[PDB]
């Protein structure tokens, strides 16, 4: 096997990390103390789950995880929480003073004094790896640490680990659950500086997850805990091919090959069904057809957009539970004739199906009901550029007036880096249309 290191930068990164590692532990039967009874080779192994967990002589299974945050309070709740024994203290890195929702403060000012420490703690994990693949980086677009320090990290990782892949799990800003007003700036700035350094990036619009929690889980005012437990189910779906026996998406390089033919256009749209509430008394269990068909409804997408007015470059269906190849092919046939699924001319109109027979694991006392079968579609569609236009428009409105800019400049950053980063986004939007129209 080949090892994968997960990095969780900033509040959103950290708490989503929490959710994922809690879930990964349930999926692999690993307990809070770190023992895994079903594992028979004590002290090591080259199993599929060992890509995400290392092992010690006492029998503990240890996440290949590094949590970074420029202030203590969030990572302190990992240190004192249910999975405190799971991690070594060196994996959990914290500063004293945060980035104040300021990209420049996170990248340039406070980034510079912690970047070398973080790289060192990452090298401690990379030296336990017999054959490192690369990195899964979790962060927010809107936070200062999430935007600023992530982009600096991604720059240095390309230098120190040039041969390795880098995947992003990115939380795109939603006004309904952010108190930060300067997120458009932060989102564009990080996306400019991280673009050449990220091989495949999975965006998750908090707006989409929030309504899925309202509409389908009946949660009146979704918390971050509600959002994170749902995101982790999606993240797990995506990373299960790395952690379980299988032939589709077995390494980080195969994600880039299958999903990203055009390297700059490396933002695949995730869609996920079914999301069903545990408080729901009577639930009729959905079939392969119904849940596959649910992947082409915008209400289930991680980012709200319209795939009908765009073109696909690649599609991946990743099933969990009671699913057989012929029930999937039948559903794909039915769906092709009813819906608008137009591909680009140079790519084959087709689907890479992956199945795991183990049904989705659900966090006890959580919001999600147990299901017989579930699916996560991963599709690189040009419709997701809708997200960029929106973000870019908001940027343009504020930046025309130089609103909030002095804060960034005041942390050393140059005004020219705003328009420089916006032109890269202006180029990116234009790449999407050339491909999609």
């Amino acid at each position: 096997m080949r090892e994968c290191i997960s990095i969780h930068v900033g509040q959103a990164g950290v708490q989503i990390g929490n959710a994922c590692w809690e879930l990964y532990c349930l999926e692999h039967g690993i307990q809070p103390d770190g023992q895994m009874p079903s594992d028979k080779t004590i002290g090591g192994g080259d199993d599929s789950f060992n890509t995400f967990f290392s092992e010690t002589g006492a029998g503990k299974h240890v996440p290949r995880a590094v949590f970074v945050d420029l202030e203590p309070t969030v990572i302190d709740e990992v240190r004192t929480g249910t999975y405190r024994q799971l991690f070594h203290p060196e994996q959990l890195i914290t500063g004293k003073e945060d980035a104040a929702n300021n990209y420049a403060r996170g990248h340039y000012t406070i980034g510079k004094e912690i970047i070398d420490l973080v790289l060192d703690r990452i090298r401690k994990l990379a030296d336990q790896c017999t054959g490192l693949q690369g990195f899964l980086v979790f962060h927010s677009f809107g936070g200062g640490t999430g935007s600023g320090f992530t982009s600096l990290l991604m720059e240095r990782l390309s230098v120190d680990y040039g041969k390795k892949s880098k995947l992003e799990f990115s939380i795109y800003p939603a006004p309904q659950v952010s108190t930060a007003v300067v997120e458009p700036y932060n989102s564009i700035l990080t996306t400019h500086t991280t673009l050449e350094h990220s091989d495949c990036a999975f965006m998750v619009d908090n707006e989409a997850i929030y309504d899925i929690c309202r509409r389908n889980l009946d949660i009146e005012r979704p918390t971050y805990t509600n959002l994170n437990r749902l995101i982790s189910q999606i993240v797990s779906s995506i990373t299960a091919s790395l952690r379980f026996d299988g032939a589709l998406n077995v390494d980080l390089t195969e994600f880039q090959t299958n999903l990203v033919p055009y390297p700059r256009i490396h933002f695949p749209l995730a869609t996920y069904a079914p999301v069903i509430s545990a408080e729901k008394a009577y639930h009729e269990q959905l079939s392969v057809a119904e849940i596959t068909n649910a992947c082409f409804e915008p209400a289930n997408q991680m980012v709200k957009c319209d795939p009908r007015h765009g073109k696909y470059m690649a599609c991946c269906l990743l099933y969990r539970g009671d699913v057989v190849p012929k029930d999937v092919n039948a559903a794909i046939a039915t769906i092709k004739t009813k819906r608008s699924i137009q591909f680009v001319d140079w790519c084959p109109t087709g689907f890479k199906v992956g199945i795991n027979y183990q049904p989705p694991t659900v966090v006890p006392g959580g919001d999600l009901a147990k299901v017989q079968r579930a699916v996560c579609m991963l599709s690189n569609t040009t419709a997701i550029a809708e997200a960029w236009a929106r973000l870019d428009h908001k940027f343009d409105l504020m930046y025309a007036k130089r609103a909030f800019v002095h804060w960034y400049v005041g942390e050393g950053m140059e005004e020219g880096e705003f328009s420089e980063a916006r032109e890269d986004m202006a180029a990116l939007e234009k790449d999407y249309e050339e491909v999609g129209v």
Binding site: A100, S178, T179, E220, L397, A400, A403
Partner: protein
């Protein structure tokens, strides 16, 4: 970033300042002698923000008391919660400042300033992570205005990266001690434009009107005005003094409220206005806190546009109903919020309500309408200054007319700058 250092300068500063520690000590369950007698752990979870822990498990305010005469600081020590303050932090001169900015800033206050800074340095030294400073003062008098703005300048030199916020009571002829207040305020505003991250513009005109018109008090005392200020000061300080999952410090807040550096003069507000039995519904709080009648600065927000709004609700209510009601006023009065800062109204809800009330809301608005305040003081200034009236009091302390002309020009610049964004 957790510890805040509070400073209170002059009669007004020390009065509203003493009420602040009266209100918040009650909310954090701290008695007049400094001992804890609460019930919720939430009362002690972020107690370090405003209190130092002392031997015997006593809580001592991180508060520095300043004046150029003993009078008001002897009243504070005699008053209901005066015993809780550290005695070393009572720093005072003798000869006063005679409502004279020059005396506060340049002559009398100069003599005292370095001893006040030593107490600041003392408090600042034993602070795990200092997030910034807050000052209470009036801009109308001598000490709070002159020495307060001098202290702000000296703190910025020694601590250039910490946040400096103020609670600045503006003068008004309606509530007026001396004819020279407009002079004192104009000289101070120029200081605050340069050296503060946020300034909470408490207008005494506005507090008076609220006591007169919308609270049926015929003869309002300073205590009646100070009741409204302490309720508001508790309000703006809640989100740091308690949780609830709000991961914010003064800088984070200042980054999201101040789009332009010079334009950081906020319009504070409070619902319901008190001096009750029926608790207000979420629609009433929302309509009231946006209501001009509940604004602590005497400006009509309809005459300006909001750059940013921050509303923080206190008590047990539906966050759904809050979101709905806050979205209802934006989407039905969208001309009064600038389009070029998307999503500029942000909101929080705290579970713990203040003393007396079952649910309240505190309003912090960075509206361009605040120009009306600075225009009013600029008019009062020019009326006197065009005949060089009362200037002898300042020139006798070594000031030149040039400095007045400058300060006049700087405030008229500030007003022009607010006008720019109101039309864009």
């Amino acid at each position: 970033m957790r510890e805040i250092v509070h400073i209170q300068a002059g009669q007004c500063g020390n009065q509203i300042g003493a009420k602040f520690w009266e209100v918040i000590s009650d909310e954090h369950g701290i008695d007049p002698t400094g001992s804890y007698h609460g019930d919720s752990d939430l009362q002690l979870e972020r107690i370090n923000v405003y209190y130092n822990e002392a031997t015997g498990n006593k809580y001592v305010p991180r508060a520095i008391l300043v004046d150029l005469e003993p009078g008001t600081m002897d009243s504070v020590r005699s008053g209901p919660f005066g015993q809780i303050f550290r005695p070393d932090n009572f720093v005072f001169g003798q000869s006063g400042a005679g409502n004279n900015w020059a005396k506060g800033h340049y002559t009398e206050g100069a003599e005292l300033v370095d001893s006040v800074l030593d107490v600041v340095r003392k408090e600042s030294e034993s602070c795990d992570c200092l997030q910034g400073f807050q000052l209470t003062h009036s801009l109308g008098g001598g000490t709070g205005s002159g020495m307060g703005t001098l202290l702000i300048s000296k703190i910025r030199e020694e601590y250039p990266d910490r946040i400096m916020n103020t609670f600045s009571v503006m003068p008004s002829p309606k509530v007026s001690d001396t004819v020279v207040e407009p002079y004192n305020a104009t000289l101070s505003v120029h200081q605050l434009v340069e050296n503060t991250d946020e300034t909470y513009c408490i207008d005494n005109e506005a507090l008076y009107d609220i006591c007169f018109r919308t609270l049926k008090l015929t003869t309002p005392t300073y205590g009646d005005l100070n009741h409204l200020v302490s309720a508001t000061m508790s309000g703006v300080t809640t989100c740091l003094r308690f949780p609830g999952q709000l991961n914010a410090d003064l800088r984070k807040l200042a980054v999201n409220m101040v789009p332009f550096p010079r334009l950081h003069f906020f319009m504070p507000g409070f619902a319901p206005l008190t001096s009750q039995y029926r608790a207000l519904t979420v629609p009433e709080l929302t309509q009231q806190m946006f209501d001009s009648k509940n604004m602590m600065a005497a400006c009509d927000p309809r005459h300006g546009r909001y750059l940013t709004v921050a509303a923080i609700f206190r008590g047990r209510m539906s966050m759904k109903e809050v979101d709905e009601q806050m979205l209802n006023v934006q989407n039905k009065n969208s001309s009064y919020f600038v389009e070029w800062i998307p999503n500029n109204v942000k909101t929080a809800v705290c579970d713990i309500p203040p003393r007396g009330l079952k649910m309240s809301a505190t309003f912090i608005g960075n509206s361009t309408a605040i120009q009306e305040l600075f225009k009013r003081i600029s008019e009062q200034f020019t009326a006197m200054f065009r005949r060089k009236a009362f200037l002898h009091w300042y020139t006798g302390e070594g000031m030149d007319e040039m400095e007045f002309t400058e300060a006049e020009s700087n405030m008229n610049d500030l007003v022009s700058e607010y006008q720019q964004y109101q039309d864009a």
